[PDB]
């Protein structure tokens, strides 16, 4: 629930004037936009309609919520799990007067915003001086074998981010070398669909973990 507001705000930054649609676990779909508040405008004053394949045009109830920047966010949530991925989905947003607001054609799951990976654990490798990282995929997310990851390695002082490691598709671990001894490192990992037709966006970083390397 709070995560959606962060994800919605993240997308709105890249396209403030657009109808933006994304999925989090490929089973649901949220389409939203943001506009200035007005004295009479509410969810009823807009009509959200969509057509999928040869289905009849359907209406989706619109919800209204505020944003930190003061814009009003209108959004619709459509189920998509039983829908085949990448099939065309036509979307229209029409004002009550019949005037146009939005008209788009999207493909199911073409903008995936995953949750962060979980269960990150750092471990001193049996090979001294190396660290093994292991983690779990974003929870309750299908197609885990098609998710790729990126690992961040950070030092304590001003050094900050010292390394970025790309994890090949479907892999949930990696071994880290070139680490300085007697040093407290901090690790985190993010996820994205590898196709990259699913959008190509990184998830938020996982909860971090830290570890003190051995001497020499």
């Amino acid at each position: 629930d709070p995560k959606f507001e962060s994800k919605a705000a993240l997308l709105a930054a890249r396209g403030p004037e657009e109808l933006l649609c994304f999925t989090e676990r490929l089973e649901d779909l949220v389409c939203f936009w943001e506009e200035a508040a007005s004295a009479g405008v509410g969810p009823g004053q807009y009509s959200f309609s969509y057509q999928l394949e040869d289905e009849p045009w359907k209406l989706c109830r619109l919800h209204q919520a505020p944003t930190a920047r003061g814009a009003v966010r209108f959004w619709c949530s459509l189920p998509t799990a039983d829908t085949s991925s990448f099939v065309p989905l036509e979307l229209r947003v029409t004002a009550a007067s019949g005037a146009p607001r939005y008209h788009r054609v999207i493909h199911i799951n073409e903008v995936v915003l995953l949750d962060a990976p979980v269960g990150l654990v750092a471990r001193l490798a049996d090979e001294s001086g190396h660290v093994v990282l292991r983690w779990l995929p974003p929870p309750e997310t299908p197609m885990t074998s098609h998710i790729r990851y990126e690992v961040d390695v950070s030092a304590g002082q001003g050094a900050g981010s010292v390394q970025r490691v790309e994890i090949l598709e479907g892999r949930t671990e990696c071994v880290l070398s070139n680490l300085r001894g007697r040093t407290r490192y901090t690790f985190a990992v993010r996820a994205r669909m590898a196709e990259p037709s699913f959008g190509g966006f990184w998830s938020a970083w996982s909860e971090p973990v830290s570890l003190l390397t051995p001497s020499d």
């Binding site: 045009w57 036509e90 029409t94 019949g98 005037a99 146009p100 054609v105």
Partner: protein
Amino acid sequence: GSDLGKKLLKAARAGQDDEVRILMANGADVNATDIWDATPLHLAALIGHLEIVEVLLKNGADVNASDITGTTPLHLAATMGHLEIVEVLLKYGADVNAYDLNGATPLHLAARMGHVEIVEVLLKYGADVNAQDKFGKTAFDISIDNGNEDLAEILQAAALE
């Protein structure tokens, strides 16, 4: 309408350039309409498939067709930022100053989405710099509302001429 017209609307919307040509070669209605009175040219200009736009216009598609919202293909191309399609539509005679039910012209929509090159192409084809939508906003006003200094400077200079 025609069975092929329904297939052409779906193929145009799906971006299937090859299937659009196949359907048309088999006699599909280039001006078929969906429940919103949108045409294959609308959907092709919307998704930005130039080759579909070309073969539709070359075979008689209505360049100035309006759906029930008053939206023309040039509106959708300008809104979605498809520069060449905006150029192709304009050279095939699209109304540069067509207005939708909001009173918005392609110049308004291109300005709102920050498409400087499309605004320039629209201006060269006679877009009305002083056209106000039903809320009284000109393209220049929209640029100020979005803090687009580049558009504001261009639109201001066009108004002096």
